[PDB]
């Protein structure tokens, strides 16, 4: 397969794609489109948002994926990042909400203008982000093993780091001194996979 | 197992869990909690949010599962409900993803004064709510037989029908006449399983 991610030029919805194919080891184009160009472009990506995957063989053609995390599972399926057992399914699954839930929290400042913004950040982190953190941990504590489910990289793991980032966005001294198990979690990961070690050391900084 | 979903008097996010147990055929306790009742409860629940679903055996005794959509995949798997391939699990989850946007739309109009709550809903069903439902009939549309993905219950049938039935709860009239692909779905998965049509009829009537 010839693989391009597409999606504008940010971390947001693609991020655990592109940190699946880096952890699997699998090249793939990152196609980022710039807000001004999108209008121009939406009409040719099916269905019309991002992230879109496009995935060209040599004998059919192209095929086109849509849908973030579901294009991420079954990436991660095929690379055997989704759990060994059922039960470790669950777990993937189950820290895979949890951060979803803050990835949703994060959601409600986008867009939002520059005073606003400031005050749904502060409501989001004083209220359901710290309670949602604290499900995270007891998550982390329950694993059998370094990182979030057992001691193998599983898509757990990098949509926990990519919400992590988010929230590190909002105010990035929300884990200074604290969250010792979020800490540890990371440097665990960095430690087992130096491809994510390296990509994340080379990602251009972005906004979101 | 003694299987007993925990949540409010409500579909919300435990019906996911209780369609799956109903297509798969497993007996469980529906525990219902009153709003009144729930901060005197909320501390013996893990984590304190529902669903959470209490499992009794009879040799070690109790496990707590947590997440709502965490639960529902697994007990799918389990039941072979994902997807018989990798590229229908793909489907499901895309489905899966597809359908919980127009959730995630839905939940906007949840605890607003009668007044906003209005101004939202005519927002989102003229707004996102028909982009999303475009997309869903794409998917329905490609299916290789007459329910979701392919010609067997999947996990994406059971959550494509509980946010529709969020959505003529915002507008009872929004399907009248239109989306035939989406009614279809619904009469093929009744027809396909006469649990479900069961559960169905016979269920309580709730605001969520
Ligand atoms: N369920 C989603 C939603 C994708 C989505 O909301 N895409 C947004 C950007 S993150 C978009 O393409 N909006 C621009 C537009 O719709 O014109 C996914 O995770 O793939
Ligand atoms: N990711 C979720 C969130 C569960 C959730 O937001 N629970 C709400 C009701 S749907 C709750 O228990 N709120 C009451 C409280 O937190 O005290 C899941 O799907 O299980």
Redesign the pocket.
């Known amino acids: 397969e010839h693989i391009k991610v597409i ?2 030029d940010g971390r ?3 991020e655990s794609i592109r940190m699946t194919l880096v952890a699997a080891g699998v090249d793939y184009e990152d196609e980022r489109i710039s807000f001004q160009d ?2 121009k472009i ?1 009409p040719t ?1 099916p269905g ?5 995957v496009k995935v060209t063989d040599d004998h059919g053609h192209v095929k086109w994926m ?6 991420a599972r079954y990436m991660a399926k095929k690379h055997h990042m989704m759990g060994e057992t059922d039960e470790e399914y669950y777990s993937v699954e189950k820290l895979i909400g949890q951060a979803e839930d803050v990835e949703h929290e994060y959601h409600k400042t986008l867009m939002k203008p520059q005073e606003e913004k400031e005050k749904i950040t502060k409501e989001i982190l004083n209220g359901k982000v710290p309670v949602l953190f604290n499900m995270i941990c007891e998550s982390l504590k329950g694993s059998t093993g370094k990182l979030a489910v057992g001691d193998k990289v599983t898509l757990a793991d990098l949509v926990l780091i990519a919400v992590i980032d988010h929230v590190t966005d909002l105010d990035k001294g929300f884990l200074t001194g604290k969250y010792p198990e979020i800490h540890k979690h990371r440097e665990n990961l960095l430690a087992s996979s130096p491809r994510l070690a390296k990509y994340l050391s080379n990602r251009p900084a972005t906004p979101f």
Chains 1, 2 share one sequence.
Do not use: D, V
């Open positions: 999606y504008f947001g919805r693609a999108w209008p939406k990506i019309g948002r991002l992230p879109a849509l849908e973030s995390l579901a294009i």
